[PDB]
Amino acid sequence: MIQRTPKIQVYSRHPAENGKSNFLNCYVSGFHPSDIEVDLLKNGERIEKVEHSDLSFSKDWSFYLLYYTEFTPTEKDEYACRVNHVTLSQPKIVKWDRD
């Protein structure tokens, strides 16, 4: 057996073809086993509608998830990604840096 803790990165992107749109991304990488729970949070509340959840693997024991959806951030709201995985004794919450 092998188990590897996910790396978690939270960032925003504007698609170049529609630059007014903005997407909140949580990229969860290099994890094993593949069992996982991932949410985007707005002010601590789970965002129920997440448009995209793309899972892949490289080696048979290395998984990658890109979990992202359109959002409209204001200066006051706080966004984050929350991950649960067998390697994490507590849920890991990674806050989005606004810049």
Side-chain angles (χ1 to χ4, degrees):
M1 65 79 77
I2 191 163
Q3 61 191 28
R4 300 174 321 142
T5 302
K7 181 184 184 174
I8 302 163
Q9 294 168 285
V10 184
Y11 57 92
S12 63
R13 296 288 186 261
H14 303 273
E17 68 276 16
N18 189 11
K20 294 284 168 199
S21 289
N22 202 357
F23 289 74
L24 179 60
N25 295 77
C26 185
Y27 178 53
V28 184
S29 61
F31 60 97
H32 200 255
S34 59
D35 302 60
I36 203 164
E37 182 177 23
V38 180
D39 285 295
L40 298 177
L41 310 183
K42 177 181 177 187
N43 301 318
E45 299 276 324
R46 173 175 170 279
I47 297 173
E48 299 179 306
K49 176 185 158 55
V50 177
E51 294 159 346
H52 299 278
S53 188
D54 302 330
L55 188 71
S56 62
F57 61 89
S58 57
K59 298 295 192 314
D60 287 349
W61 56 88
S62 190
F63 284 77
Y64 305 85
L65 180 76
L66 186 64
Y67 189 67
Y68 73 98
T69 204
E70 193 169 352
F71 81 142
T72 302
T74 66
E75 309 306 329
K76 69 262 286 190
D77 290 317
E78 61 173 316
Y79 294 90
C81 185
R82 180 177 64 205
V83 176
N84 283 299
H85 190 257
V86 290
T87 57
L88 297 170
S89 51
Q90 299 166 312
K92 183 152 183 57
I93 298 172
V94 177
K95 297 188 175 177
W96 175 52
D97 188 320
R98 299 206 126 282
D99 295 300

Coordinates of all heavy atoms in Angstrom, one line a residue, residues 13-22:
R13 N -8.9 32.3 -11.9 CA -8.6 32.5 -13.3 C -9.7 33.1 -14.0 O -10.9 32.7 -13.8 CB -8.2 31.1 -13.9 CG -7.0 30.4 -13.4 CD -5.8 31.1 -13.8 NE -4.6 30.3 -13.3 CZ -3.9 30.5 -12.3 NH1 -4.2 31.5 -11.4 NH2 -2.8 29.8 -12.0
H14 N -9.4 34.0 -15.0 CA -10.3 34.5 -15.9 C -10.1 33.8 -17.3 O -8.9 33.9 -17.8 CB -10.1 36.0 -16.1 CG -10.2 36.8 -14.9 ND1 -11.4 37.3 -14.4 CD2 -9.3 37.2 -14.0 CE1 -11.2 38.0 -13.3 NE2 -9.9 37.9 -13.1
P15 N -11.0 33.1 -17.9 CA -10.8 32.5 -19.2 C -10.6 33.7 -20.2 O -11.3 34.6 -20.2 CB -12.1 31.8 -19.5 CG -13.1 32.4 -18.7 CD -12.4 32.9 -17.4
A16 N -9.5 33.5 -21.0 CA -9.1 34.6 -21.9 C -10.2 35.0 -22.9 O -10.3 36.1 -23.4 CB -7.8 34.3 -22.6
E17 N -11.0 34.0 -23.3 CA -12.1 34.2 -24.2 C -13.3 34.9 -23.6 O -14.2 35.4 -24.3 CB -12.6 32.9 -24.9 CG -13.2 31.9 -24.0 CD -12.3 31.0 -23.2 OE1 -11.1 31.3 -23.1 OE2 -12.7 30.0 -22.6
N18 N -13.4 35.0 -22.3 CA -14.5 35.6 -21.6 C -13.9 36.2 -20.3 O -14.2 35.7 -19.2 CB -15.6 34.6 -21.3 CG -16.8 35.3 -20.8 OD1 -17.0 36.5 -20.8 ND2 -17.8 34.5 -20.3
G19 N -13.1 37.3 -20.4 CA -12.3 37.8 -19.3 C -13.1 38.4 -18.1 O -12.5 38.5 -17.1
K20 N -14.3 38.7 -18.3 CA -15.2 39.2 -17.2 C -15.6 38.1 -16.3 O -15.9 38.3 -15.1 CB -16.4 39.9 -17.8 CG -16.1 41.2 -18.6 CD -15.8 42.3 -17.6 CE -15.2 43.5 -18.3 NZ -14.5 44.4 -17.3
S21 N -15.6 36.9 -16.8 CA -15.8 35.7 -15.9 C -14.6 35.4 -15.1 O -13.5 35.6 -15.5 CB -16.2 34.5 -16.8 OG -17.5 34.6 -17.4
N22 N -14.9 34.9 -13.9 CA -13.8 34.5 -12.9 C -14.2 33.2 -12.3 O -15.3 32.9 -12.0 CB -13.8 35.6 -11.8 CG -12.4 35.7 -11.1 OD1 -11.5 34.9 -11.4 ND2 -12.3 36.7 -10.2

